[PDB]
Design a binder for this molecule. Structure first.
Ligand SMILES: CCCCCCCC/C=C\CCCCCCCC(=O)OC[C@H](O)CO
Ligand SMILES: CCCCCCCC/C=C\CCCCCCCC(=O)OC[C@H](O)CO
Ligand SMILES: CCCCCCCC/C=C\CCCCCCCC(=O)OC[C@H](O)CO
Ligand SMILES: CCCCCCCC/C=C\CCCCCCCC(=O)OC[C@H](O)CO
Ligand SMILES: CCCCCCCC/C=C\CCCCCCCC(=O)OC[C@H](O)CO
Ligand SMILES: CCCCCCCC/C=C\CCCCCCCC(=O)OC[C@H](O)CO
Ligand SMILES: CCCCCCCC/C=C\CCCCCCCC(=O)O
Ligand SMILES: [Zn+2]
Lengths: 352, 68
C-alpha cells in the first residue's frame, strides 16, 4: 500500500535494447558527422553562410553524440558517473538539442532569403555575418539549456542510482509546464512556424516560369519574353510551346533543352533544406507530443499507475527515436545531396 | 522534460496517511519531475518504499533529520 508505481518490465527491456542501439547510433553518428565536418572544411572549404550553418549543425550533433555512450551505460546499469557528470552531460545534451533545431531553422531562413529576397541577401549573407549569427546562436542555446541543468541531479533511489530532473514541489506543475513548453515551443512550434512561413514564400517563387537552355548551342529560352520571330508569344511556359518548335540558333528540338544551372541548383538547395527539416519532425515530433501528454496526464485522465506505464513506454520509445536522429543528417546528405556523394567519392579516391 | 530515461522512473499515486516510525526509515528520495504528482519516497531498514506527501510537516521534518 502506498508504494511507488513500478515500470519493472519497461526498465528491464530498455536495459537490454537501448545500449546496443545507442552504441550503433554513436558509431554511425560519430563517423558520419566527422566525415561531414572533414568535407565541409577541407573539400567544400566553407565559402558561404550555408556551409557555416551546416558545419555548426554537425557540431551540434557531436555534442549530442558525446553524451550517448553515457546514456547507454545508464540504461545498462545505473548512474555511475556522479552528480557533476550528470549535470554536465545533461547540459551537453540540451545544448546539442536546442542548437540542433536552431541551425536547421537558420538553414531554412538562409535559403529562404536567397530565393525570395535575392537582392537583400547580397550583403546579409556574408560569411562574416554567418559566423556572428552562429556565435549568438550557441550562446542562446546555452541559456536555453541552463534551467534543465540546474533542475537535474543524480540521486540514490533505493538500490539504483539515477540522473533525473526534479522540480520544487511547491511550484511543481508550474515548472513542469514551463520546461515542457520551453521544449515544445522551441523544438516544434517555432520551427513549424518558420517552415510554414518560409515554404509558402519559396513554393511561390519556385513554380514561376522556368528558363531553359539549348544543350547544343547554349541558347537560353527566357519565358518572360518568349520568342516572337518564331511564333512564340511572350510569357509562354516552355511546356506551352508548340512541339514542332526548334532552337532559333541551331534548330534542335525541345528534346535537347534543359533547365538553366541557377534553376536546378535552386531546386537542389531547396530539396536539401526541406528534407532535413521534415526528417527532423519525423524523428522528434513524436517525443514532443508524448511530452505534452505526460505533462498534462491529469488533464487527459492518464494519471494512474496502469495508464502512466503505457505513457512511459510511449515516452521512452519516442525519446529513443529522437536520440537516434543525431546520426541521420549525414545519411541524408549521402542520399539527397549530389555535392556530398561526389566529394565522398573523391574522399575514397584520395585514399588510393 | 529533462535528461534521457526519465520514463524508466517510478511515480506515486497515493501517500501514506500517518507518519512512519522515524526509527524504521533509512533514506529518502524525491520522485522524478516526469511524475504527475510531487512525492517523497522513504526507504525502510526492510527496504520497503513508501510514498509520502512533501507538503506534510512530518515529512519535511523527517527529511531534515536524515540530512544531519
Ligand atoms: C527507428 C530507430 C529506433 C526507433 C525506436 C526504437 C525503440 C527501441 C527500444 C525502446 C526501449 C523502450 C522499451 C519499450 C517497452 C515497451 C514494451 O516492451 O512493452 C512492455 C512489455 O509488454 C512487458 O512485458
Ligand atoms: C566520447 C567519449 C566516450 C565516453 C565513453 C564512456 O563514457 O564509457 C562509459 C563506460 O561504459 C563506463 O563504464
Ligand atoms: C567503439 C565503441 C563505441 C562505444 C560503445 C560504448 O561506449 O558503449 C557503452 C557501454 O556499452 C555501456 O555499458
Ligand atoms: C519559452 C518559455 C515558455 C514558458 C512557458 C511558461 C508556462 C507557464 C505556465 O503555464 O505555468 C502554469 C501555471 O502558471 C502554474 O501555476
Ligand atoms: C510529422 C509527423 C510527426 C508524427 C505525428 C504523429 C505521431 C505521434 C505519435 C504519438 C504516440 C502517442 C502515444 C500514446 O498515445 O500512447 C499513450 C497512451 O495514451 C497511454 O494510455
Ligand atoms: C513517426 C511515427 C513514429 C511514432 C512512434 C510512436 C510509438 C510509441 C508507442 O505508441 O508505443 C507505445 C506502446 O504502448 C509501447 O510500445
Ligand atoms: C534512415 C531513415 C531515414 C533516412 C531518410 C532518407 C532520406 C530521405 C529519402 C529521400 O528523400 O530521397
Ligand atoms: Zn541551339
Amino acid at each position: 500500500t502506498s508504494e511507488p508505481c513500478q515500470k519493472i518490465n519497461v526498465k528491464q527491456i530498455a536495459a537490454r535494447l537501448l545500449p546496443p542501439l545507442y552504441s550503433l547510433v554513436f558509431i554511425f553518428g560519430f563517423v558520419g558527422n566527422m566525415l561531414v565536418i572533414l568535407i565541409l572544411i577541407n573539400y567544400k572549404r566553407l565559402k558561404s553562410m550555408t556551409d557555416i550553418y551546416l558545419l555548426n549543425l554537425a557540431i551540434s550533433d557531436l555534442f549530442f553524440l558525446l553524451t550517448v555512450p553515457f546514456w547507454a551505460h545508464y540504461a545498462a546499469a545505473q548512474w555511475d558517473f556522479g552528480n557533476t557528470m550528470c549535470q554536465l552531460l545533461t547540459g551537453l545534451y540540451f545544448i546539442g538539442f536546442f542548437s540542433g533545431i536552431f541551425f536547421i531553422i537558420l538553414l531554412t531562413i538562409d535559403r529562404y532569403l536567397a530565393v525570395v529576397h535575392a537582392v537583400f541577401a547580397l550583403k546579409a549573407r556574408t560569411v562574416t555575418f554567418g559566423v556572428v549569427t552562429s556565435v549568438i546562436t550557441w550562446v542562446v542555446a546555452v541559456f536555453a539549456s541552463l534551467p534543465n541543468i540546474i533542475f537535474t541531479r543524480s540521486q540514490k533511489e533505493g538500490l539504483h542510482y539515477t540522473c533525473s530532473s526534479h522540480f520544487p514541489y511547491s511550484q511543481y506543475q508550474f515548472w513542469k509546464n514551463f520546461q515542457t513548453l520551453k521544449i515544445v515551443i522551441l523544438g516544434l512550434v517555432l520551427p513549424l512556424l518558420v517552415m510554414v512561413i518560409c515554404y509558402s514564400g519559396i513554393l511561390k517563387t519556385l513554380l514561376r516560369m522556368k528558363k531553359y537552355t539549348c544543350t547544343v548551342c547554349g541558347y537560353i529560352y527566357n519565358p518572360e519574353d518568349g520568342d516572337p520571330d518564331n511564333g512564340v508569344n511572350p510569357g509562354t511556359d516552355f511546356k506551352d510551346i508548340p512541339d514542332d518548335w526548334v532552337c532559333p540558333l541551331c534548330g534542335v528540338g525541345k528534346d535537347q533543352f534543359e533547365e538553366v544551372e541557377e534553376e536546378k541548383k535552386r531546386h537542389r538547395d531547396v530539396r536539401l533544406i526541406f528534407t532535413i527539416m521534415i526528417v527532423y519532425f519525423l524523428f522528434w515530433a513524436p517525443y514532443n507530443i508524448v511530452l505534452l501528454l505526460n505533462t498534462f496526464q491529469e488533464f487527459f485522465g492518464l494519471n494512474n499507475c496502469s495508464s502512466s506505464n503505457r505513457l512511459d513506454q510511449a515516452m521512452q520509445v519516442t525519446e529513443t527515436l529522437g536520440m537516434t536522429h543525431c546520426c541521420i543528417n549525414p545519411i541524408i546528405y549521402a542520399f539527397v545531396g549530389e555535392e556530398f556523394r561526389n566529394y565522398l567519392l573523391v574522399f575514397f579516391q584520395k585514399h588510393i | 522534460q529533462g535528461p534521457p530515461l526519465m520514463a524508466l522512473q517510478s511515480c506515486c499515486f497515493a501517500y501514506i496517511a500517518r507518519p512512519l516510525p522515524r526509527a524504521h526509515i533509512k533514506e529518502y528520495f524525491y520522485t522524478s519531475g516526469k511524475c504527475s504528482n510531487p512525492a517523497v519516497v522513504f526507504v525502510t531498514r526492510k527496504n520497503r518504499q513508501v510514498c509520502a506527501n512533501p507538503e506534510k510537516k512530518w515529512v519535511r521534518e523527517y527529511i531534515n533529520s536524515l540530512e544531519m
